[PDB]
Design a protein around this ligand. Structure first.
Ligand SMILES: COc1ncnc(OC)c1C(=O)Nc1nc(C(F)(F)F)c(-c2ccnc(C(C)(C)C#N)c2)s1
Ligand SMILES: COc1ncnc(OC)c1C(=O)Nc1nc(C(F)(F)F)c(-c2ccnc(C(C)(C)C#N)c2)s1
Ligand SMILES: COc1ncnc(OC)c1C(=O)Nc1nc(C(F)(F)F)c(-c2ccnc(C(C)(C)C#N)c2)s1
Ligand SMILES: COc1ncnc(OC)c1C(=O)Nc1nc(C(F)(F)F)c(-c2ccnc(C(C)(C)C#N)c2)s1
Lengths: 606, 71
């Protein structure tokens, strides 16, 4: 019954004399060996020691308590496996006393425990420290350096990096090093006061080298690609436009002013893992990832915006206009073949271009959220399928080819939207590709089918069997359902004469149906409109920019290797002793930050 | 009505939960009866409900306990 007494005296901390006398009693019991001492010094249910319980419960007399505990542990030559002890429970496995000393913002006791020989690579490899998803657990990086940097303790981060045995390049279970962890924890614009940016810069400069940033976690992502995968716009803006002005760490920068004269300044940005020449770059990840809902702000960053503009103005404008022209003439030929259908010059350019579109969009689908971005692939493929099916049915002796041919013509004129999404007149279609297709139309369809079936039964039931037009178009259940459908389609007519024993109840239910379907339609209407015209114009412009970037990257994938190498955004530039990294030049004019220009690669501007 | 929807849903759900709990037999209620006994003081022994919350906008430090060992 001494374990519980030691734990209570160490957690309550009301007096260190209690734990001193209890430790005297424990040493007396020990004289009559190390495994016994620490099995009486730990809690077998979790593996926690009295040191963790002392640090988990900080009180005005806890520094003296940990001093007493460490003195008693060193006076028995057990302090090695006592200060390095760790939990054993599945949830908090691997957590040691240094993790608890740092998580409690106790810097003095942390220095004490590192001086006593607590290994500083203790990985908190538990299911609480490596949560399946955030908000259920606390992921900081599974390491005392990551825990000191994530909890905003730069004093402890300096104390940890100035140590000798620290592993700055240590990678946790998730594959993350300190920088992936900092990217993961980084929150927002003004939520965490951008302290994670400070820790990122400090840890990267302390260990001035490119190994922390070129290290791939288990998802094959570097800290930069990991900031691209998530929606860390601030950390991405920092890493991308990062200018170190120290003389020794200048090669760590990703942006280099080389040109400033007055307000004019031409700066280079680095495009190594950014310009779609590699496996998956910041550009690819930022454009194609549909899981952040922040591409509006990440595609306007310093190198990415101009990279997209340059790709566009260089080849993507031409490829896009050429494909729009080809599809327009395809649709005109389809329209003239559908109008002059044989109820002759070329009716196969339609067919060859339809087969080309079908195979292209089919290969595009085969390599894959997928109804908003990759929507037009399906409709272009369906249109091409309809065209080739119309041709096959026409050369066979089928008179059912006209339906597919006219449907294909109409669907092609509809697919003409993909080219005109940013024209301020096809705005509502471009945005209701996103709004109405999600769930409101399916909710509407469910409620409308319920209305239709219920009122069809209610109205067909009210009608009397009559000798064979029956005086009633609401006869069987199917005729009532058809009349109701035609009604909501503005194709019918309501008459007070329907051969019912209760004509007033029939009229009541009919008008009730009319009004309820109108309410449904108008809910869907105000949903599809949702004007806030400023915000809907933001939405249309944002959709146009996102699809513009997406099609720029699509078009860059179609070119051969030699044409891609001939476009090849980025001029080769020497930025250090021997660095020679491909950069992208951006000129700016700032009339506010007046500074003497001491960082530059060229002294003669121009 | 965007929020009024959540208001009305929450009120209807609370009333439904309470009337359902009233409909059950006393032994069934005694079976469900969330909340577990917990010693709080010398002799307090109150029915406490454990609530593990995660406020990921935290900037503070905690040092207190009843069972410092994380459950
Ligand atoms: C720029 O648009 C055009 N310009 C000139 N001519 C055109 O057609 C001749 C067009 C055009 O959009 N045509 C279309 N064809 C079809 C197809 F069903 F056949 F696929 C369309 C379609 C598809 C799916 N759901 C609907 C709704 C929900 C509205 C219903 N009901 C309509 S729409
Ligand atoms: C999901 O809805 C359905 N699904 C399948 N079948 C259905 O009916 C066959 C229905 C349906 O709504 N039925 C209805 N019954 C009645 C009633 F006569 F009982 F009052 C309706 C009614 C009539 C007049 N004023 C109102 C209010 C006060 C709301 C207004 N304004 C409601 S509506
Ligand atoms: C008793 O009538 C109803 N009861 C309950 N609900 C209803 O609608 C939900 C309705 C109803 O009339 N519905 C309609 N549907 C359509 C259609 F667009 F499909 F053609 C309608 C139509 C038809 C012809 N010209 C137009 C113009 C050019 C004026 C437009 N715009 C609209 S009208
Ligand atoms: C085919 O649709 C049209 N075509 C050309 N012109 C039109 O205007 C006359 C119309 C038209 O909407 N007629 C309508 N009459 C009525 C009725 F209230 F009388 F039932 C409508 C109705 C029904 C249910 N809930 C509403 C709400 C509350 C949303 C509103 N507001 C309105 S709708």
């Amino acid at each position: 019954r001494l374990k519980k007494r030691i734990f209570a005296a160490v957690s309550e901390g009301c007096v260190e004399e209690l734990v001193e006398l209890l430790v005297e009693l424990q040493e007396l019991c020990r004289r009559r060996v190390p495994d016994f001492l620490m099995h009486k010094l730990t809690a077998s249910d979790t593996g926690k020691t009295c040191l963790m319980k002392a640090l988990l419960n900080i009180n005005p007399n806890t520094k003296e308590i940990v001093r007493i505990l460490l003195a008693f542990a060193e006076e028995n030559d057990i302090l090695g496996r006592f200060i390095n002890a760790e939990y054993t429970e599945e949830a908090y496995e691997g957590q040691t006393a240094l993790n608890i000393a740092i998580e409690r913002r106790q810097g003095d006791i942390a220095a004490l425990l590192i001086a006593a020989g607590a290994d500083v690579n203790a990985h908190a490899k538990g299911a609480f420290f490596n949560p399946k998803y955030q908000h259920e657990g606390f992921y900081f990086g599974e390491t005392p350096l990551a825990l000191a940097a994530c909890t905003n303790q730069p004093e402890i981060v300096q104390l940890l990096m100035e140590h000798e045995q620290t592993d700055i390049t240590s990678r946790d279970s998730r594959g993350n090093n300190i920088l992936h962890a900092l990217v993961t924890v980084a929150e927002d614009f003004k939520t965490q006061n951008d302290f994670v940016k400070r820790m990122y810069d400090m840890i990267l400069l302390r260990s001035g080298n490119w190994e922390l940033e070129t290290t791939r976690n288990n998802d094959g992502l570097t800290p930069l690609q990991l900031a691209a995968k998530m929606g860390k716009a601030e950390i991405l803006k920092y890493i991308l436009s990062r200018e170190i002005k120290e003389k020794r760490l200048r090669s760590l920068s990703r942006k280099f002013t080389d040109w400033a004269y007055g307000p004019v300044s031409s700066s280079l940005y680095d495009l190594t893992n950014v310009d779609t020449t590699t496996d998956n770059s910041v550009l690819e990840i930022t454009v194609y990832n549909t899981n952040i809902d922040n591409r509006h702000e990440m595609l306007t960053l310093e190198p990415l915006h101009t990279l997209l503009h340059m790709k566009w103005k260089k080849f993507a404008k031409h490829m896009f206009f050429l494909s729009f022209c080809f599809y327009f003439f395809y649709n005109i030929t389809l329209t003239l073949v559908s109008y002059y259908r044989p109820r002759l010059l070329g009716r196969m350019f339609v067919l060859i271009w339809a087969m080309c579109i079908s195979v292209k969009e089919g290969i595009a689908i085969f390599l894959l959220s997928i109804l908003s971005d990759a929507w037009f692939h399906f409709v272009f493929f369906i249109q091409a399928v309809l065209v080739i099916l119309s041709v096959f049915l026409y050369l066979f002796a089928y008179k059912e080819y006209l339906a597919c041919l006219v449907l294909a013509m109409a669907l092609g004129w509809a697919n003409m939207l993909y080219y005109t999404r940013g024209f301020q007149s096809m705005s509502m279609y471009s945005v209701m590709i996103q709004k109405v297709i999600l769930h409101d139309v399916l909710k509407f369809l469910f409620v409308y089918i319920v209305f239709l079936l219920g009122f069809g039964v209610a109205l067909a039931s009210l009608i009397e069997k009559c000798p064979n037009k029956d005086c009633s178009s609401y006869g069987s259940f199917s005729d009532a359902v058809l009349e109701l459908f035609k009604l909501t389609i503005g194709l019918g007519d309501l008459n007070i004469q329907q051969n019912s024993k209760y004509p007033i109840l029939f009229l009541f239910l009919l008008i009730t149906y009319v009004i309820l379907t109108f309410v449904l339609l108008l809910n869907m209407l105000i949903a599809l409109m949702g004007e806030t015209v400023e915000n809907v114009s933001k939405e249309s412009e944002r959709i146009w920019r996102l699809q513009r970037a997406r099609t720029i990257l699509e078009f860059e994938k179609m070119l051969p290797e030699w044409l891609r190498s001939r476009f090849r955004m980025g001029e080769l530039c020497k930025v250090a002793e021997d660095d020679f990294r491909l950069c992208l030049r951006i000129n700016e004019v700032k009339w506010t930050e007046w500074k003497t220009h001491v960082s530059f690669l060229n002294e003669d501007p121009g």
